Amino acid sequence: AYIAVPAVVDSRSSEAIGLLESFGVDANDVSYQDHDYVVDQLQYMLDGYEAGDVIDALVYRNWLHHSVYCLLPPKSQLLEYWKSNPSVIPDNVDRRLRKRLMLKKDLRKDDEYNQLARAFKISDVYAPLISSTTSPMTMIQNLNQGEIVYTTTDRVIGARVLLYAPRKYYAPHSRFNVGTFPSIATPKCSVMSGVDIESIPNEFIKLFYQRVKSIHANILNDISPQIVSDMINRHVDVYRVDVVNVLFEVVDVADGLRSVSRKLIMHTVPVCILELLGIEIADYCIRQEDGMFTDWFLLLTMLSDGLTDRRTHCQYLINPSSMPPDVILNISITGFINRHTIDVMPDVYDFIKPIGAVLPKGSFKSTIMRVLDSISVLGVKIMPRAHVVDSDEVGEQMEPTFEHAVMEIYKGIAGVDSLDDLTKWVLNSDLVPHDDRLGQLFQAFLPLAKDLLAPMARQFYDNSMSEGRLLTFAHADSELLNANYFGHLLRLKIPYITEVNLMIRKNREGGELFQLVLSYLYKMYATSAQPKWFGSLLRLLICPWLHMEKLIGEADPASTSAEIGWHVPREQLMGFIPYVSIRAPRLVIEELMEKNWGQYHAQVIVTDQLVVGEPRRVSAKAVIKGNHLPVKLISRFACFTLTSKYEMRTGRGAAYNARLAFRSD
């Protein structure tokens, strides 16, 4: 039996991962194949040939007929190796050619050797032979015959390649086997159907499976993970989180009767949050006595990367208000249809540097800055409020502030005075803006946004880079680009309607419709780049820490923790500020004691008074000179905080060429 799963399977490692219970199969007899090398071999295979020949060749290959390649030096070193110390010449050889090879001190002057060598072919001796002009189909079709295949080139696909000569001449089954490529040559070979072709994270397995299901879809023996669990029976990495989707529906129980309105889906919630919140297939009220969402459905919608319905397939942004064109108040969860892993660590996060998250104007900030401040998984704090900079704060240290500065833009438009008249002039009864008038307002908004805000933002962000590594919210995309912001640029959105948020909140300090107009100004000020689903940051923020305590937990607080920070020598006249903080098991921090923390230099200015009831502290300022810190310099196995202020354990202080120092116990 041979089934196929949508993930890279190695025999020694994916057993340690388990990798089959991760799709949802309860489970010896299950022997794993090593399909690690075929993916890199496929990547080397694709750059020369086309796609379809390579894929349609690899499809027709069984993974039980065990075989191997053979690679030989082309012609001159082939005859030279037979000339050399081994006389291991096969019996297919020419009777005259082996006789001329068994002699000593052959050279160019030998006409009798050279005349026969210039008419000698490799295909005379070795058959079947893969040359460079052969199709990829006939390579595998000839490979499925005779347990060894002779080649000429490296660029082959299939089994392992072994070499014939030394490099100086060149230029075990069980009953159930899993793999990552569906075979067709056996009437019985199977493919699992858990996840679709849209959530496969390898980008070569995805390209393979789309082409397989494009043409061979009728003849695939298809099974589900429940049927796999029927057929079977009768170090620990972080940043790999199982995800599922919630198939729910909104119900409207008025009094007695209930109705069903929509049939929604919520694409990539993590499984650990669903386990720790303890939710099941039942009904739920998702509103409080006020009408706010009750602090767990809010977190579920802030973890996902999508929310659509199932009858049509358009994006569904839910209503956060309580005005009833469409109020979502009751939820009935009905199942979980796909399950796979995901690498939570993104691509853009390479060097340790501050995080600029771009949210729109009416997104929920006042709730998430309350919730993220109140999380603690271990003896650390994940994201305190003192490390978070609002989008508001950058334009407030100014002669009358940027909101009030563009509040008086009305002086300059003909027929416009008394700001309510401007807000009546721009928006109609629909509160959708007119096409020209919003741009006519924007052509006066824009020099106030660029020539007045951006130098102050550049100065403020230099100051914020100096006094620690923080997280900075931002309204628009270009607000972090016209000001030369240094850090990771994150474009985010929430699954909610940000517009009707702007009419719920009172105490807005100005026109309540004016801030909706100002939100439209920022929405048009930004560039045309696609934002990336706030759950893409929130899973990074929460889910590695929550997975950490299941295996770091109660080992010892002294020797699971360690911290990185800048170190000044003791010889000073009147020191260790922290940079990150790392919590890991014992072997990982023992592997962190090496990888020396030199080749990283700053210039610490350290002068302040004691400020709070905690012990002696001076809020220093470190400015990194050299390169910033890579993450693979730390680990893949050790979680670390992202934001930190600067302080050390009276007198004064000056510019100190600091260095780092890994301390632990």
């Binding site: 027709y60 067709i184 299901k213 043409i215 879809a217 629909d430 509160l431």
Partner: protein
Amino acid sequence: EIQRHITEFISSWQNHPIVQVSADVENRKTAQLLHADTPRLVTWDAGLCTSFKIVPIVPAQVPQDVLAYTFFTSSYAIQSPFPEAAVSRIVVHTRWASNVDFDRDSSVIMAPPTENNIHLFKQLLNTETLSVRGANPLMFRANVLHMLLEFVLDNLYLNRHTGFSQDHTPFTEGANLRSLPGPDAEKWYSIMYPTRMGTPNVSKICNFVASCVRNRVGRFDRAQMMNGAMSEWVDVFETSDALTVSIRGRWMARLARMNINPTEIEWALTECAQGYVTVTSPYAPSVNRLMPYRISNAERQISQIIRVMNIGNNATVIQPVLQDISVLLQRISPLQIDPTIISNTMSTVSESTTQTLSPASSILGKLRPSNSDFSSFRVALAGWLYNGVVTTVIDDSSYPKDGGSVTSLENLWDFFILALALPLTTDPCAPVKAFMTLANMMVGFETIPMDNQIYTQSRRASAFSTPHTWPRCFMNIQLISPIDAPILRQWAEIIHRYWPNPSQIRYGTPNVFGSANLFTPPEVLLLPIDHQPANVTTPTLDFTNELTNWRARVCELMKNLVDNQRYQPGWTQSLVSSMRGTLGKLKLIKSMTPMYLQQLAPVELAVIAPMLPFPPFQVPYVRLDRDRVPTMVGVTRQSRDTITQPALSLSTTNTTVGVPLALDARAITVALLSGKYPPDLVTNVWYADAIYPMYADTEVFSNLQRDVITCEAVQTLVTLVAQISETQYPVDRYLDWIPSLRASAATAATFAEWVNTSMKTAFDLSDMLLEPLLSGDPRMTQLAIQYQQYNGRTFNVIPEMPGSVIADCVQLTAEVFNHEYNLFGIARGDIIIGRVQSTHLWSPLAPPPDLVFDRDTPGVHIFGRDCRISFGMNGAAPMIRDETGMMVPFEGNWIFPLALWQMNTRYFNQQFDAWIKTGELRIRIEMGAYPYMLHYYDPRQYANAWNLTSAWLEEITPTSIPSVPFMVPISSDHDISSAPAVQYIISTEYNDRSLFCTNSSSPQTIAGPDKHIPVERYNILTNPDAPPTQIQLPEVVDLYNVVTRYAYETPPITAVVMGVP
């Protein structure tokens, strides 16, 4: 309106367009044409084929006073096939007990009727309906049609043979019970076999079960073909749904019509190869497999028409196809480049160093080889498969740039290049371009008469593109004077005599592959040149064919030109002799390319052409005949004003299709002058080695499967749109009692978008089905194609529309729905609002005939267009006016249309509701069709319907109405004391087919409406004289019949047809 503008904003947010095809699609058309995916045809169902589940509503009174708890089977935890409840109804739910491979993403899932089922009927066209409840009553027919389409498309499965087990209880006579898989399967057997239950009581279930036939349970027929193998098909008695059984029987009939066994697969892959590779198929008793691939001819032709309509005047969709066939010819062709043969042969041309001109060295600069010259030759070789949509011409830059005198030597070589390159292209004006190329170069040297002052002799030869820019002096050679233009008189006869001759080559396998060509017969391809099959397989250089003759006579014309007496004394003798030697050698160059084009290229075009993602599309080639040059190949996709016949509406409602593409003339004649063979080539070894990896794929077998769905969805579209619009095709309409609006072209286009989206949601498709037809006017659609010659004579092809399965099954489901509208949550007729106060226990879904009235009832006032209400003055009664011009008070029996109430739903409520509640008038509101709730009530207590019916009357809107609420009493099994109940809304027709049984585990029903187990459904059990196959399907659905269960396997083609390498 501060809070109200938020509602307006959200209601203008939620009306976003569902279709965003505003961007261009011609980057996706190319990928679809080069590689279209297969649909998913065969899917297996291991459960039991049903769609109706019997749901309980009100639980039974399992403790009571008049009967002990030891009577009921529920006290002993005995599992029963039916819910032991007080009221049981039938609701509709597709694919419960269905362990499918994967779902079609279709579902008609319904709540029980005590809940609200309005969300199924506001799905389609209610963009502008505000409330959560309520739907537009002018959308009901389109909503029901989409619901029936989903209901059909959710049942397209094949039944699977799971496995049996003989029982050990004495409940049956040792019968063989089915075992169906799943996580929890020990409770399906009570549901699946009603007659297996023991009979303790005189409860209604036990009165039904013990009054049936015993030997109709489990297995009764199998086909055992081999020892120790799966049985291929069985026939089983179990709970089923005869509509679903009918749908899956028709689907199995279609897939059994598509079936082939590997013997003709062997024969077809031999005939397509033309013997150059052979394959095998075994000779043994079969294991009864199912490989659906053989389709008809018209299904292939229709998809060919749709693809030709896709490539419309674009030349960037069809360019990668010719570029693909270039690489595919390059893979298996034996010919190769040899660029050095001209540079070798021009090393022995006798000339003098003293001269300034050099005829030996001018050709090598004019005709430089660069090894990328077959990339422009194999495209011209591949363009012979398509003259209808592709017309390969010579590039503009390959012409001598405003004339060029014949005294010049470089332009004289430039003439030779074009004269060799022009017969290869499929452009019909190639001979007149070849003639005018010389006639441009001879201006003031030799003159011939023209047609006008515009297309003169000096008019550029590339400007002759239309087949009647041909000069009269070209088709009458006598008009060219033999003594004042003798060389043009020569070249005209050379064109009229030695131009190549078209032929035909016979590709294709007509049996398995449906032939795709139109305007040519099947199993034939047309070539521009002549071919002769070779007798030898060790080929060698010969000089007797049309291309070598053409090269020789162009060289001899240039020899007569250099030997002309007006042209020679302008030169010296050492230059004339060198040019004559160069021409005499260039005639006798030794290249294999004219022999290859004669003998081997027509074989390997026919080898390739069936195995091709876009099949050949040709109109007839012709040399030199002006009257048979084809213009305007054109497809249609719609009719016009009132002409409903395609042969009449074809000539004025088409779209001309086709492109020219440009190739250079240098690279074709480098290929023609320079080409050689391998050293020891033997053709029956070379082609047998080359063709063998090509014929292990199955992509053409996937395209044959896609053409089924591409022809099927068109007839599905026509049949479904004809139920709401006025088309020309003869269809059968059933849903006229359901009201709808007068649909426009925008409504028809939107409904057709929903049709093909639901069509490609099932079958697992991801690109571009039926949008070429969808882009304009889906009401009147038709498919045809035509071209004409120059003389106005038109050929045309109107392919017939073959049999469709989904379009038949939708009409079958509508025929059932006409008699079982109740099960899908729809009522028929209209309601009568009036105060009825009594203690009786009749049900409002079956009212007594004393309370209803119609238009034929004497003394009933009818209200129409005219709704004018006069108020009351000084105590007189207010009045409303009749249709006949009378003026009546607010009393009696009235008849409204629903739209009259909807247009005046505020002004009528204040005037009428206080009179309906307490006074003495009763209003009949004509609707035709409506959904309904069911609020039950305990019949021992008081019950007023006014809070329900006032909430129904106040939610009526010019857009929508909510579902109609009723009040049905709860039946009991012992005597109860009666309390007065007031109800206002009753029905008119019978409306109580949805009820299954009342007091299921009880001896009798005394008070309230009763209904026993319906004997007319379970016909096979209760009637001992009926055959087991019999279904009375257009009237009732019977919920139990024999179903066949297959165990066929679907292997790939290469698992049975090997190929012998």
